[PDB]
Amino acid sequence: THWFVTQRNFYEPQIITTDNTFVSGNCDVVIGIVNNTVYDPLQPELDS
Amino acid sequence: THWFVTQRNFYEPQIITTDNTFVSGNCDVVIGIVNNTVYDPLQPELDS
Ligand SMILES: *[C@@H]1O[C@H](CO)[C@@H](O[C@@H]2O[C@H](CO)[C@@H](O)[C@H](O)[C@H]2NC(C)=O)[C@H](O)[C@H]1NC(C)=O
Ligand SMILES: *[C@@H]1O[C@H](CO)[C@@H](O[C@@H]2O[C@H](CO)[C@@H](O)[C@H](O)[C@H]2NC(C)=O)[C@H](O)[C@H]1NC(C)=O
Ligand SMILES: *[C@@H]1O[C@H](CO)[C@@H](O[C@@H]2O[C@H](CO)[C@@H](O)[C@H](O)[C@H]2NC(C)=O)[C@H](O)[C@H]1NC(C)=O
Ligand SMILES: *[C@@H]1O[C@H](CO)[C@@H](O)[C@H](O)[C@H]1NC(C)=O
Ligand SMILES: *[C@@H]1O[C@H](CO)[C@@H](O)[C@H](O)[C@H]1NC(C)=O
Incomplete structure (x- = not known):
């Protein structure tokens, strides 16, 4: 059901974040890519 | 008197921060843990 990085x-599963992951380019090039939220740890701090 | 990560x-002593360290669980499980302030680098920016 859930997606984790370990x-x-x-x-040792933990939530997907912009700390645990690095970007590279648009989604079309990668074979077998999957869709999810990636949490951005700044956003609750920015919001408060 | 002062705690550093090197x-x-x-x-090469550096101030302990949420950039040069990572979390895992509560303080009870680790044998020989110590208490000190981890400087969160976002807090001066949340003050701004
Ligand atoms: C996949 O792992 C997640 C994280 O452990 C499970 O989600 C938790 O499930 C329990 C029991 O239903 C809830 O009490 C928690 O509140 C859930 N946490 C979150 C963040 O949703 C999930 O149940 C697991 N899925 C399967 C099929 O085992
Ligand atoms: C992953 O999510 C993207 C974005 O929602 C999906 O891409 C769209 O898919 C529909 C149906 O095939 C197309 O009409 C759109 O043109 C696609 N692009 C966008 C930007 O919406 C994608 O289908 C999802 N993939 C899976 C495997 O669920
Ligand atoms: C490290 O810091 C914590 C938090 O201040 C200390 O935890 C307290 O320990 C006393 C022991 O009698 C308890 O009565 C308190 O309830 C604890 N506080 C909390 C918030 O749980 C801990 O003792 C310190 N450890 C060392 C080795 O100095
Ligand atoms: C994995 O195998 C299934 C077999 O039905 C296939 O449908 C799917 O396209 C394969 N995955 C990828 C990334 O092509
Ligand atoms: C460290 O070692 C001394 C001597 O062996 C012992 O008395 C002490 O309890 C130990 N403390 C920790 C945190 O392991």
Whole structure:
């Protein structure tokens, strides 16, 4: 149901964020890409 | 008197921040943990 990012050699799931992930280009080029939220940790701070 | 994070093979003390550190869980589980202020680099910008 949920999407997580984890270290490779031990299951420690954590929320997808702009800290855990890096961008590269538009979605069409990658074979097998999937859709999700990526949380932006600035936004609750910016909002308050 | 003061707590720093340094690279391992050459002494270069840096202030402890949420950039040069990462979280995992509450303070109870770790044997030999210590208490200090992690400087959050966004707080002077939230003050601005
Ligand atoms: C996939 O993992 C997530 C995170 O552990 C599960 O979502 C939690 O599920 C429990 C039980 O239903 C709830 O109490 C939590 O509030 C849920 N957390 C969130 C952030 O939604 C999810 O149930 C797991 N999915 C499956 C199919 O096992
Ligand atoms: C992932 O999400 C994107 C954006 O919602 C989906 O792309 C759109 O898909 C529809 C139906 O095929 C097209 O009409 C649109 O032109 C697409 N692009 C945009 C920008 O809306 C995509 O289909 C989703 N992929 C999966 C596997 O669910
Ligand atoms: C590290 O800091 C925490 C938080 O101030 C200390 O936790 C307190 O410990 C006393 C022990 O008698 C408890 O009565 C308090 O309820 C605790 N506070 C909280 C907010 O839980 C902890 O003792 C400190 N550890 C060391 C080794 O100094
Ligand atoms: C994975 O295999 C299924 C087999 O039905 C196929 O439909 C799907 O296109 C494959 N995945 C990718 C990324 O092509
Ligand atoms: C560190 O070592 C000393 C001597 O072995 C012991 O008395 C002390 O309880 C230890 N403290 C921690 C935090 O491990």
